Structures are given as structure tokens and as C-alpha cells.
Design a protein around this nucleic acid. Structure first.
Lengths: 58, 129, 62, 19, 106, 36, 58, 270, 67, 57
RNA sequence: CGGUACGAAGUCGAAACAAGGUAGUUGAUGGUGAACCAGUGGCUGAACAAAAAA
RNA sequence: AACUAGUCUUAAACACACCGCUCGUCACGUAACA
RNA sequence: UAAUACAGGGUUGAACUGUGGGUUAGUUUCAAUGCCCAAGGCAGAGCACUGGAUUGGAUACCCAGGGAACUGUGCUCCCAUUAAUAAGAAUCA
RNA sequence: AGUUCUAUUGUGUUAGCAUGGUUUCG
RNA sequence: AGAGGCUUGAUAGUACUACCGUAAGUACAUAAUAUACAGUCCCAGCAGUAGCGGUUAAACUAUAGAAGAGUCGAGUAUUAUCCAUACAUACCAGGCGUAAAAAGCGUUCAUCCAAAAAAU
RNA sequence: UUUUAUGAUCCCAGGCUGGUUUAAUAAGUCAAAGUUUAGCCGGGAAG
RNA sequence: GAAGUUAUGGUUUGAAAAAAAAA
């Protein structure tokens, strides 16, 4: 199969932090990954350290 | 049409052996015309992408300029005696789409058929729209 | 307006590389320089096209 | 294909699905 | 109304838009936008004009009332209509010629 | 926006235009507010 | 880390240099502009010393 | 010159204020919240008899939906709708199942907003999901008309038709809000309120004059955008007579969510 | 825009606001009491001597002609 | 040289004459080869741009 | 009427440009012969000063 | 710890170069709009 | 920004699905402070104002006190209005 | 891209709590 | 001068239809004049944006200022009109970081375009 | 029930069309729109 | 005789009728 990729347009927009002295997120949070971002493997070349937890479930 | 206007960018690369462009049957036909005119060394079809192996001469590339005529938001058509005037005194390649296929402006002029002007390759500074 | 915003356009320069043989042939033909003694040897052993061979270097994942 | 109006889009459809 | 000059009428853009507009017997194609009234339909038809200044064609809609002897053209069906030369009643001015695409019913 | 923002900056609009934002000197809006 | 309640977006080069880690010029994008080379012509600037032009071959 | 000496306006200007909800509105909201809160007699996720037999009755009760959270109840309801409208056992992406799940999610978010009326981001999420459901309905209408009708019937939502492009007149336009209006009668319509249509001022019991920015919503009729029986006639309204379908009241209305002349669609959240 | 240019608009806006505040106190509304043509009016018609009709044709006027 | 070698030089000097001499020296150093055809005709029209400057051939 | 543009430079101060000698300016305000001042929230089209590691 | 001459860095709306540039009320005539 | 309750979004995988989208007014959910309205009302701090200084002089900068404003599903979007210089496709390993 | 589930939540609204500047009481 | 009108401070290539360096008003008569001079002095005045005039002006006024100089010519100049020369009305053929310009962030209708272009 | 942001409802101003040559590798139709003998049209009444 | 035929300027100030009800 030969199928083109889907658009990188997403609803809602981009994270906005409310102006003023509240510190509240008008939309989304600080961990949001934009669609136009490199791979996780590209961004984290080292990978998990030797002292990280293999299973992340709490 | 959008894919061809995109492939213009991939064709206008410099200091590159080969460059990739989006795939489309219209792109394949235009590439066939370009190779028959000896403007590219070759090309390869790989799924969603086409890899164009470009041709150079004395450092500079063979393709020195691309002028887009027919955009997806505006068609451009010409009668034979308008195509003759518009391509007057020019060694460039004006790609034409007709009922007989994607051909050169010289084939279109000899056939005397009405065509849609897509691109102009190495046409210097010669355009009207 | 702007300056170097014309990608795939006037940002790059598509000019030919003229080596010693080409430049000297042009100078001699136009008569701006008297034919040097080495020119015959250079012509009979033309320099290679280094840019084409340069374009053959490919990046490899480690 | 330039003018994809309602009528043009209705007339330009070879099949229900574009697989 | 718009008048094209003699030289303008020879250009490929003008000729092609004229060819698109014209049909035998001045027939037109459209889709039904009203089927409440008996033996009548309101049809929206695509019509194109070529603007010389910008060398491109834009599309507009022509909405007319036609006569449908039977009851076979529902809302959202693509139909071909032909002019009459006279106005039947206060509205109808065309006559249904054929149904091209039928929106599913029931 | 050039001449329009110039009028805003020099304050002609501040005087002559109603504002649902109100203020004690600006003209107010007595009708329900909507984006225009 | 501290919580400033938002970020700043200065436009001038001076304030950007003050408020950013570095404003070092990066390599030109190969898709936008050509690479800098030793053969590029130098800027056409008259040589001056303390405001006086040093233009004399002898 | 002869003129009457004029002076700055001396009088009382109405105070802009929110339109109070009518008793029918409040009762409908309470009915919707109660129905959402109702917990059926079933377990969570996909536990069944053999799975639950091994545990003790106390732990089985812990598993039961009565102890379950709102998310688990919502997932159970979506699973039931999927099992109703699915192509095959694990079909969750077919447009019918997508329509069912989007409707359920919209209802859940509407209940959550009625509770946490100060949660602003969920109103934006609700608008996004309304648009997505509208697109899914538009796709399914063309793809499979009979199944589209069946899904709308089963979900008790308005069966909007996309035979011809929608209109730019809000009195005629489709209303994704008005969809699923059977559940919520307050999400049906609303009177025009801009410029000449703004509500007029009223003197309250306290003795102050207040002007509502919106018209207090009246309970819509049960005959809203429904087929009607027509008597034979030949007039300006019917310059060629009346079809037998109009006479019998069997005709079809493609936009059952049309607000109608003098009415806007209901607000996203009130 | 820059701070230096902003000061001009600052001053003019402030003067407008101040002069309106000055009149805010009052309550009695003050009372305030053309053969020549404007340039836009003059630009509508052409004065060149055509065949007779002063302003009775498209060739006489400067309106957008459909052609 | 009027045959395919041409260049332009920009240079500074204490006086206009010395500035011109330095500019001529710079042009001589900057000479390059123009790709002409022995037939003495252009194959296409040519355009050159630099900000608001336009050259048409 | 209030405001506005041109010529003139007269009286009163010194508000901005340097940390302009109290950073500037902005939204809506309060106060003041004048430029302006004060609070509040924005921006930078602002400065000063500015960490080693237990 | 201070000053002059430098020399270096930063800022600048200064470049006749801080004895710079520069804001406004009031006063003063010619006008348009209102 | 601890736990808990109710809702998103993001990331990863499996399944489903099968051009089902990109942009968006005769559209409307949200949105600093101030102002209007309502609430409360003296933890702090704090316009106007008062009086203790400096200044030819200050209606300020400094000090003391201070009933305006500081928490709202209301009225509501003026702005140096919020993650930037609008959104999407293409060119790169 | 979308729907369902899956692991994770310095996101938004939430009854209450631990801690703390400040003021307060002796 | 067989004749007048305008210019007589710098600045504009004075276009362009056949010819496209393939020739003589070529030589003699036959060599030049004006950033020479005079009147006025931030006045009178001129001028097209820039600008000139400060008591020795190629910039104002004066051409017996000389049979003066440049152009057109029975005409020539000023004003006016414009699709007012590429003040590209920017499709050909302009812009929106900093110089005018991205809507406060968003959800959508209609239109527009994409993906089976041209043809069907 | 019929129109309507593809501008409905509803003011003021204007009849439309053609004209051969036409310099520049700007033309094989003068090239988005500039005309000049002309073309088409422009109620009724002795009641 | 028929069928198709982009509106422009004056800055513009979006819904207009019919029907229903009313007395």
C-alpha cells in the first residue's frame, strides 16, 4: 500500500498562558508536543538510564 | 498540479546529486519529458516519493530556472498562434498539457492544438502571467 | 521588502566553474594573453571535474 | 482540476470510496 | 452587462469558458434546490466568467425554475434543463430534459 | 490599519466610538454585545 | 525551577542578546542559503582608525 | 435662531444582566443530570459471570457499576452503544460507531459542564467535538444513507440531510447543537437578540430597571420542523397547487434543526 | 513603532481625553451654528468636448465600465 | 575587453582620481568570463535583481 | 462652543533621549497652570546588580 | 575613596556633536472644519 | 504545582476505519487590569486626600495615615491582547 | 488524522489540609 | 535675420517605423562665444523637489551683453485633462520581524483549493 | 410560502457598440478598461 | 423572435415580504 501522511493540523491551537498574575494555562500544558516536532528517539538519543524504571506503572 | 508546483522546488536544488519530490502521475509524465529533453540524469519512483538524479555541467546545474505558469488556482490555456508568440525567440522548454499528452511547446506548435501551459524550464526571463 | 528570502532563486548562484584550461583558452582566443608554454600540456592533460566527484559523498548512519 | 464546486464534486466521483 | 472586445473573444481563456458555458439548444446543468411545488423545480446551475485583467475564471450560480411534467427530480438531484422561450405561470421558464445523478431516496 | 491604527493611536476612536468595555469617559453600549 | 508565570518575546537584537543564552550566528540552512566560503568578496568598507581613513599605499 | 435648549440625558438606563432560566429550563436540566447519574445493574469494563465468580461477593460488589467511577460508567455506556451499532465485535472506528461514541462524549461533557460551569476549556472541547460529529454525520450520510437513517433513529438524534450545501442564514443553517435535541429541550432554538431584536428593559420587584442581553428561553413546541398536513390551495404561497405529499404530511425536511425565521440556534452552554 | 514615535500619539490622545474630561462636568449642550464643487465630484465627469451631451454617457463619465 | 571578460570594482581613495585608479585595479582583479555564444545572439532574455535594482537584457 | 493646521518667537517650568538624574511606555482610571504625577495590570520600544559543590 | 589624560566596554532620539537634542500650558495673528 | 472528585490534551502500543481535509462569516465559547453592577468589608498593602520634610516652587519623587480598586458561571474584550513574525503542503538522514 | 482500550499525568474546575510571610493574644 | 516663441545654474541620451560602421555641406572660405560684463543685496525677486539672493550672482533684472549661445519653427510657450513614462492600479508587476500592514487565542457555515492534473 | 452576504429589501448618478495605421524582435487581431462621420434602440394623446 | 451576458461610485448604517395572531 502507498498512502500519503495525514495533515499536521490539530484542533484547538497552541498552548497559551493567561496574561496577568494567575499562572493559569488558557489552553494545554507545558509538556505538549507540537505536531511539527522530531521523533522521541531523535530528541532523546541516550534513552532510559540504567537507574530508570523499566515498568512505569505506579 | 499542487504536486508539480511542489516538485519545482526539488528540481531547483543546487550542489546536490539527487533530490526527492512528491509522487504523482503528472509528475512522472513531466519527468519523462524532462529526461527526453536531457535536463535530468534520471529519476526513480519509490512509493510516496520520487528521487530525481540531477544533471550538472561545468559545476552549474543544467536546470537554471523554472517558471510556473498554470497553478492549481488558475489555469492558463493558449491557442497555437498565441503559443507561438509567447514562446518566440527562446530556447527554453515550455511544458504543455494537451489531449495528446504532456509534450513540449514545439510539439504543440507543430500539431496546432490548444494546450495548457504548465512550466517553463531555462526560459530566461520570458513570461506573461 | 526583504533580502535573502528567495530560496530556490537568487539566494544561490548557478555559475560554471572554469578551470585553468578553460580560462587560459578563453584568454588566448580573445587575445588578452600571449599563449603560455604550459598551455599545450595542460590542454592535452585536462583537469578532472572535482565538483562532480564531490557530489558523490554520502552521509552514513553510525 | 480547478473548479470543485458542489456540482463539479458530485459529477467527479468514480466510486463511493477512494481506497 | 459585460461586453468582450473583438481581440479578447479570440483568446484561449475566453473561448474555453464560452465552450464550457454553451451546450446544444442552450441547455444547462444544475442541481435541485426546491421541490415543494408540483411539476416544478428550482435548479442551481454553475456559470463561469473569464476576467481578462487577472487572466482567470471564477464560477457563480444561476438559479432558475423549470417544468417537470412527472415527479422524478427531488432535492439534491443533478439535472439538465432547456429553455422554453415563454414563462409558464409566474416562475417556470425552463423544462427538464434529463436526470444525470439521483440522490438516494427512502 | 495604517490610517485606522493611526486614528486609534491619536485617539479619535477613543472619543467617537462606543465601547462595551465602558469606562467613565468613553461612550457606552446599551445593547447586548457581539463581535462585529 | 522558578515559576515566572509566562515568558517574554523581545524583538530587538540588544534585548534578545541580553535575555537569551547565546545569539551566535548559526550555519546557513542548506535549503535556504549557500554555505559561506573563503572566496566570498569582503564587505566594501573603507579602513578607518579612530575615525580617520587610512587610504594611502605609501 | 429658534431652538429648544437641550441638556444631557436625565433618566435611568437599564442595567445589562443575564437572562434567568425558566422553571421548565431548570426542570429539564435536573432531568438530564438525573438521567446521566442513573447507574444500571452491570459491571465495569467487560467482566462477566465466570470472571466475577472467582471473587468473593464483597469484591464482586466492589467491581459492580455502583462503586464504579463516572469514567467507568461512561465507558460502559459507550461500549453498549458500540455493541448496538458495530460492524463486528471489535469495530470501533466505523462511522456509525464513531457517531455513537461522539454523541456519548458530548453528553458526558455537557453534564460535566452543568456541574463545573466554571470549567472553560471543556466548552472549547465540546465545540470541537460537535464539529467532529457534524463531519462524521456528513460523511456517513453520503457513504450509507439507510444506515445513516438507522443510526440517527436509534440514537434519537435529528437526522440532518446533506443533499445540498448548507445555507449562510442562521435561521436556516444546520445546528449541531440542536442535534440530540430530544434529550435536551433547552438546546433547540433561541430568539434573535442583536440590535433591533435586543430584549427590552423591565422593572424588577426591587424597583430597578434591568435589560437582559438574551431573551429568556421559552419551551419549544413539539411540532418544531415536523411535517404538516396542508389543505389544497392556489395562491401566492402555492402558485401551482399543493403536492399530494404536502397534503398528506408525508414529505421530508432535510434540515430538522433549522432555527426558523426570528430564531437563532441555542447557545453552546448556558 | 518605536518609543520616540509613540510620544506624539501619546500626547495627542492624552490631550483629547483631557479636553473631553474638561467638558464632562457640564450638562447644557452647547449650540453651534456651497456653490463650489469638491475634487471627487469634479473627477466624475469628463470636460473634453465630445458630441454634444455634457454628462450623458459612459465615455463622458469615469465610472467603472463593464468591459 | 569587449569580448567576454568584464568586471566591476569599488574602491576608496583620498581623492576622486586615486579612488578611480583603485576601483580600476579592483575591477581588473575581479574580471570574470561571460558565457557568450560565438554567433553573437542571446538564447533567452535575462533579468537581474538586487533589492530595488532591476537589470533587463 | 470645545478642539485643529500654519507664522512668530515671548513668559513659565524641564516631561523624554545616558540609570536623562523617580526606567519608559500602554489599557481604563483619580488628581494637577503646563509638560505631567499616583495606584493597578500589561509589555520592553529598560537599566543596576548578579551563584561553582554540598 | 574620589580627579585629569588616556585606553576598553555598554547606551543613545546627540553628529553645529550635553553650552546637544527636546515637551507643553499661556500669550500672539492667518485659516479650514464644526 | 500534596491527596481526593470530575473532565481534557499530549505521548506510546493494539485494534478499528479507509481522501472522511487545508482555510474559514450573515457564527459565537473563552479571555489581564480598569470602569459600571453586585458582594462583602477592616490579614496585608494601597488612588484621591490629610500633614512631616527637600525645593525660588513644587499640585511629585522621600516619611506617617489613609472609607477608591484587590477573590463574581454579570456587564464584559479597550490594549505594547496573551508561545513569539497567521494557518497548511514541499524541499533535509 | 479520527474512534475504542491501554500506561502516564506540574492542564482546567473542585469539598476539605499540611505548611508559611504578615498582623494578632499573653 | 529670409521669423518668432521658449531656454541661456546643475539634472533627464534628447527615443523608436527603410537603412542598421559600407559615408563626404570632404577640402577652401573657416574660426569662436557667456562660470566676460553691468544693475540689486536674505531686498527686489526666481524656481521643479533640492534650492539661489548676506553689497564682486554662469540661479534675480538686462541680449546694441555682440552680426552672442541651445532647440523648435509658422510657430511657440503657460495652464488644464489622463490608463499622468516602472508616483508599475503591482495578473505580467508591490508589501505585512525591525520601516504601513497577521484579526487576542479558537469552533464552524458558504466559497476556494488539495488528494485519480488533461480526457472521460 | 418566496427572496437573501453569489448582496435580498431598498435611495441618488450615468443608453450600449464599432473605427483599418499604430515604430520597440511590445505581436498574426493594439492585447483588463481611453475614439470620431456610424450600428442598435429610445411611449401615447383633435375625444 | 430566442439564449447567455462579473456591475461601478456616493464610507454605509442585513434582513424583506407573505402567512399566523390581534382587536
Amino acid at each position: 500500500p502507498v498512502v500519503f501522511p495525514h495533515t499536521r493540523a490539530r484542533a484547538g491551537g497552541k498552548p497559551i498562558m493567561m496574561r496577568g498574575k494567575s499562572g493559569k494555562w488558557h489552553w494545554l500544558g507545558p509538556y505538549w508536543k507540537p505536531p511539527w516536532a522530531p521523533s522521541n528517539k531523535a530528541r532523546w538519543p541516550t534513552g532510559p538510564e540504567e537507574w530508570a524504571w523499566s515498568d512505569p506503572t505506579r | 498540479m499542487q504536486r508539480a508546483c511542489e516538485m519545482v522546488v526539488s528540481l531547483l536544488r543546487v550542489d546536490a546529486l539527487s533530490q526527492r519530490c512528491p509522487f504523482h502521475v503528472l509528475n512522472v509524465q513531466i519527468l519523462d519529458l524532462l529526461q527526453r529533453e536531457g535536463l535530468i540524469r534520471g529519476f526513480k519512483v519509490d512509493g510516496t516519493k520520487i528521487d530525481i538524479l540531477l544533471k550538472h555541467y561545468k559545476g552549474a546545474p543544467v536546470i537554471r530556472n523554472i517558471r510556473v505558469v498554470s497553478k492549481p488556482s488558475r489555469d492558463i490555456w493558449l491557442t497555437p498562434h498565441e503559443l507561438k508568440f509567447r514562446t518566440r525567440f527562446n530556447t527554453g522548454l515550455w511544458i504543455m498539457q494537451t489531449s495528446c499528452g504532456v509534450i513540449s511547446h514545439r510539439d504543440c506548435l507543430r500539431m496546432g492544438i490548444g494546450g495548457k501551459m504548465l512550466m517553463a524550464i531555462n526560459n530566461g526571463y520570458q513570461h506573461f502571467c | 521588502g526583504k533580502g535573502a528570502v528567495h530560496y530556490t532563486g537568487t539566494n544561490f548562484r548557478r555559475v560554471q566553474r572554469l578551470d585553468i584550461v578553460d580560462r587560459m583558452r578563453a584568454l588566448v582566443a580573445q587575445g588578452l594573453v600571449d599563449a603560455p608554454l604550459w598551455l599545450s600540456a595542460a590542454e592535452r592533460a585536462p583537469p578532472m571535474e572535482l565538483s562532480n566527484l564531490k557530489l558523490m559523498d554520502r552521509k552514513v548512519h553510525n | 482540476r480547478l473548479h470543485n464546486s458542489h456540482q463539479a464534486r458530485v459529477l467527479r466521483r468514480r466510486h463511493v470510496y477512494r481506497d | 452587462h459585460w461586453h468582450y472586445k473583438t481581440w479578447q473573444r479570440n483568446t484561449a481563456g475566453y473561448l474555453r469558458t464560452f465552450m464550457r458555458n454553451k451546450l446544444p439548444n442552450n441547455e444547462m446543468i444544475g442541481y435541485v434546490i426546491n421541490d415543494k411545488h408540483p411539476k416544478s423545480i428550482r435548479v442551481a446551475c454553475d456559470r463561469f466568467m473569464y476576467v481578462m485583467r487577472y487572466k482567470k475564471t471564477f464560477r457563480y450560480t444561476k438559479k432558475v425554475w423549470a417544468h417537470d411534467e412527472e415527479s422524478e427530480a427531488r432535492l439534491g438531484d443533478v439535472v439538465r434543463i432547456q429553455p422554453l422561450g415563454y414563462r409558464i405561470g409566474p416562475w417556470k421558464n425552463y423544462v427538464l430534459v434529463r436526470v444525470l445523478h439521483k440522490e438516494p431516496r427512502d | 490599519c495604517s490610517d485606522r491604527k493611526r486614528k486609534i493611536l491619536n485617539g479619535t476612536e477613543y472619543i467617537r466610538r462606543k465601547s462595551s468595555h465602558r469606562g467613565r469617559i468613553k461612550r457606552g453600549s446599551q445593547a447586548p454585545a457581539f463581535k462585529r | 525551577a522558578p515559576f515566572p508565570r509566562g515568558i517574554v518575546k523581545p524583538r530587538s537584537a540588544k534585548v534578545r542578546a541580553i535575555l537569551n543564552l547565546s545569539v551566535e550566528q548559526r550555519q546557513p540552512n542548506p535549503l535556504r542559503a549557500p554555505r559561506k566560503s573563503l572566496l566570498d568578496p569582503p564587505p566594501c568598507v573603507a579602513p578607518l582608525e579612530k575615525g580617520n581613513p587610512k587610504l594611502d599605499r605609501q | 435662531v429658534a431652538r429648544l435648549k437641550s441638556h444631557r440625558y436625565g433618566g435611568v438606563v437599564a442595567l445589562k444582566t443575564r437572562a434567568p432560566k425558566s422553571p421548565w429550563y431548570i426542570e429539564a436540566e435536573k432531568e438530564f443530570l438525573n438521567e446521566r447519574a442513573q447507574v444500571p445493574d452491570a459491571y465495569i469494563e467487560r467482566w462477566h459471570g465466570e470472571d466475577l465468580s472467582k471473587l468473593s461477593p464483597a469484591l464482586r460488589r466492589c467491581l459492580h457499576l455502583r462503586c464504579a467511577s463516572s469514567k467507568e460508567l461512561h465507558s460502559w455506556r459507550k461500549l453498549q452503544l458500540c455493541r448496538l451499532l458495530q460492524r463486528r465485535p471489535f469495530d470501533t472506528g466505523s462511522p456509525a460507531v464513531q457517531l455513537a461514541c461522539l454523541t456519548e462524549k458530548i453528553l458526558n461533557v455537557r453534564a460535566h459542564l452543568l456541574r463545573h460551569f466554571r470549567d472553560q476549556q471543556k466548552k472549547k472541547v465540546l465545540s470541537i467535538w460537535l464539529s467532529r460529529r457534524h463531519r462524521v454525520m456528513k460523511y456517513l450520510y453520503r457513504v450509507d444513507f439507510n444506515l445513516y437513517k438507522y443510526v440517527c433513529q436509534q440514537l434519537r438524534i435529528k437526522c440532518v440531510r446533506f443533499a445540498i450545501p448548507d445555507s449562510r442564514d442562521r435561521q436556516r443553517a444546520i445546528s449541531p447543537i440542536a442535534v440530540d435535541g430530544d434529550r435536551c429541550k433547552f438546546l433547540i432554538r433561541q430568539k434573535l437578540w442583536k440590535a433591533r431584536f435586543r430584549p427590552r428593559q423591565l422593572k424588577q420587584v426591587d424597583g430597578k430597571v434591568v435589560r437582559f442581553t438574551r431573551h429568556p428561553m421559552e419551551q419549544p413546541s413539539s411540532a418544531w420542523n415536523l411535517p404538516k398536513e396542508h389543505r389544497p390551495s392556489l395562491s401566492r404561497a402555492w402558485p401551482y397547487g399543493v403536492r399530494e405529499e404536502r397534503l398528506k404530511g408525508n414529505y421530508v425536511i432535510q434540515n430538522p434543526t433549522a432555527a426558523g425565521l426570528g430564531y437563532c440556534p441555542a447557545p453552546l452552554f448556558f | 513603532i518605536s518609543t520616540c514615535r509613540r510620544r506624539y500619539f501619546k500626547m495627542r490622545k492624552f490631550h483629547k481625553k483631557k479636553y473631553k474630561k474638561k467638558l464632562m462636568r457640564l450638562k447644557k449642550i452647547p449650540f453651534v451654528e456651497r456653490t463650489w464643487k469638491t475634487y471627487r465630484e469634479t473627477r466624475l465627469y469628463r470636460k473634453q468636448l465630445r458630441r454634444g451631451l455634457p454628462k450623458k454617457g459612459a465615455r463622458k463619465l469615469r465610472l467603472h465600465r463593464e468591459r | 575587453n569587449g569580448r567576454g571578460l568584464f568586471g566591476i570594482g569599488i574602491a576608496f581613495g583620498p581623492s576622486p582620481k586615486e579612488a578611480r585608479s583603485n576601483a580600476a585595479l579592483a575591477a581588473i582583479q575581479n574580471l570574470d568570463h561571460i558565457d557568450f555564444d560565438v554567433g553573437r545572439t542571446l538564447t533567452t532574455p535575462v533579468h537581474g535583481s538586487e533589492y530595488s535594482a532591476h537589470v533587463k537584457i
